[PDB]
């Protein structure tokens, strides 16, 4: 709830960053600077194979960190604009929700544990195919469906 921060550039909101675990996470393709002046001083490392940048969380903000897991049982999941469905290895959300600039939102489990970070999506007839960056034990992976566009 309190782990969400805004990214602004030239007076407009471009996207979001999220604090999870012990690391700061931000999509690589989003431009701008962070609203909190304290985070602006960190040095960030970039790898285009996953479109992900990360840096170390400072000590005095450790109480704001969210909990996480890796288990992904089939069922229903929740996020800011409504409900999302996970089945068959892909996340599908009804068409009409979402628009450019919504990058960085987390998807939560039943108990409030974070399982995924969303970026972009693909347009179909009655459903939307989402592109997501997840993680597993000791590695991370990227899932991207055909025809997806950046958000």
């Amino acid at each position: 709830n309190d782990c969400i921060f805004e990214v602004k550039h030239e007076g407009k909101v471009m996207g979001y960053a999220c604090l999870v675990g012990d690391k700061v996470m931000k999509p690589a393709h989003v431009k701008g600077t962070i609203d909190n002046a304290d985070l602006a001083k960190l040095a960030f490392k970039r790898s285009s194979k996953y479109d992900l940048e990360c840096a170390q969380i400072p000590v005095h903000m450790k109480s704001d960190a969210s909990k996480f897991t890796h288990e992904k049982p089939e069922g229903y999941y929740n996020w800011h604009h409504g409900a999302v469905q996970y089945s068959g290895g892909r996340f599908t959300i009804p068409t009409g929700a979402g628009k450019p600039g919504d990058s960085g939102r987390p998807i939560f489990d039943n108990k409030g544990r974070v399982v995924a970070i969303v970026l972009g999506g693909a347009n179909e007839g009655a459903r939307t195919a989402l592109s997501v960056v997840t993680w597993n034990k000791d590695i991370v992976t990227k899932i991207t469906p055909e025809g997806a566009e950046e958000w």
Partner: protein, 48 residues
Amino acid sequence: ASHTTLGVQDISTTAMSWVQKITGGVGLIVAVAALILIVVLCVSFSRH
């Protein structure tokens, strides 16, 4: 003089040995380093 001139390929036996050792040594360093790069590159390709 009653003999012909010499060319660039005419070098004493002692001098030739030093050239071979130096060029061979430097070449090995490039060869070993090249193999490590190839192994890492394949792992990244396949794992994704």
